[PDB]
Design a protein around this ligand. Sequence first.
Ligand SMILES: Nc1ncnc2c1ncn2[C@@H]1O[C@H](COP(=O)(O)OP(=O)(O)O)[C@@H](O)[C@H]1O
Lengths: 39, 260
Amino acid sequence: TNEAQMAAAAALARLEQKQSSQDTIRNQVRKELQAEATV
Amino acid sequence: NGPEIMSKLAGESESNLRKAFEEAEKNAPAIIFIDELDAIAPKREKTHGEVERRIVSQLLTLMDGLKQRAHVIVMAATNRPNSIDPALRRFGRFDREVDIGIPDATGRLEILQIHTKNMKLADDVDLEQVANETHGHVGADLAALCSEAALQAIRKKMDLIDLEDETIDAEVMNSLAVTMDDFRWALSQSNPSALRETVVEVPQVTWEDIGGLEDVKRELQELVQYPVEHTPSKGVLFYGPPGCGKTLLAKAIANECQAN
Ligand SMILES: Nc1ncnc2c1ncn2[C@@H]1O[C@H](COP(=O)(O)OP(=O)(O)O)[C@@H](O)[C@H]1O
């Protein structure tokens, strides 16, 4: 039913958050940006 | 301490060792200090006696018991980390260690100033010069140095004062000063205990002591500055003709950085 469908959306969202290229590339650039900012 | 437990007979020895640990729990928070760790727990593979091997095992179990003996910390003193049974140094037990080393020229002066807190010094006494010359001396050597200088000063005056009673007059002690002749005499009798050991300290050689090499000095400053402002380099090789100051360059950069 619809109450289970809302539980389905929550279970799938947590699975995707646990599984998670874009954040690895952005984080690697962020680290290099801070080093170039202070050097 | 080792000798206190090892002097005991089988059974009494292990009993006294574990009893002290039980007392620490009862009086927690508490610190258990085990002196001469290499004497209480020598390497098992280096002994033949059953008593020594059992004592090592008993200490190992007592260290593990610290999971229940809340707020009890056990400290131990040894001469070398490699003079004790390696089991003690495994995760847990004694998994933290600190190298005390030998006091440097500044520390030796501070130690002398501590020992002379109760001592009246004459105007000719220069403890900084003494601290610079007393290479190879540790705090217990400087304690003996001050004691010997004190006794020499006492003898010189008491032979003439002739105060023979149960108590000493505060006035004649308060006027007694220890001079440079009394420290010099004591220095000639003192014998350093750490003369053969390596002493590590901040050097006193600075850039003004090195002639020329203006570009080398700047390059060395960049080496130590870049790892802080920003793989940074952690070393440099000096090569070229002999007698140009290779050692002085290494000391001068340590000096300015306040590094050992
Ligand atoms: N650039 C320099 N400026 C002044 N004195 C120097 C210089 N290079 C060498 N010396 C003299 O040579 C001696 C030996 O220097 P040192 O660096 O101890 O030799 P090494 O590095 O080969 O052990 C020093 O006592 C110093 O007086």
